[PDB]
């Protein structure tokens, strides 16, 4: 599935893994994907999130409250949570339905919203960003 990703989408997932590592987390969850979308900085997802007032520090703060720093450094390669796998699979489906044969940062964010149930979704709502508004912003920046 990674072979469909744009270079900047690949960067999102790489940064998600680095954020999980920094937090001493044992899985790449949806919240790490959200942090990766922000860290990537330049894509439609990052720009959408900046527009909606969703900051790297706000998300990190929420993740610290909900999950907390782990005590032991994990390995270089961290597995995805089931929910994060689902998000990636849905990102593909978003792209396909919109007529794209590639997965960009926009599609990863749309997939995160489509899944809508995991830690990232909980954090977005806690930070004042209803999922529906997030999708509209993405679609808007795309149009």
């Amino acid at each position: 599935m990674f072979e469909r990703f744009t270079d900047r989408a690949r960067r999102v997932v790489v940064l998600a893994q680095e954020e999980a590592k920094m937090l001493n987390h044992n899985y790449i969850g949806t919240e790490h994907i959200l942090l990766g979308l922000i860290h990537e900085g330049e894509g439609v997802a990052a720009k959408s999130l900046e527009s909606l007032g969703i900051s790297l520090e706000g998300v990190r703060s929420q993740v610290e409250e909900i999950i907390g720093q782990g005590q032991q450094a994990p390995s270089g390669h961290i597995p995805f949570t089931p929910r994060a796998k689902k998000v990636l699979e849905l990102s593909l489906r978003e792209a396909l339905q919109l007529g794209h044969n590639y997965i960009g940062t926009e599609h990863i964010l749309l997939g995160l919203i489509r899944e809508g149930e995991g830690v990232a979704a909980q954090v977005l709502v806690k930070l004042g960003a209803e999922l529906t508004r997030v999708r509209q912003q993405v679609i808007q920046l795309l149009s």
Binding site: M1, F2, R10, V13, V14, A16, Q17, I28, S75, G76, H77, I78, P79, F80, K85, L88
Partner: peptide
């Protein structure tokens, strides 16, 4: 990869 056992090239883990 999208599973568990050993390191994918870039991100995640995979099984045999």
């Amino acid at each position: 990869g999208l599973r568990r056992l050993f390191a994918d090239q870039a991100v995640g883990r995979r099984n045999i």
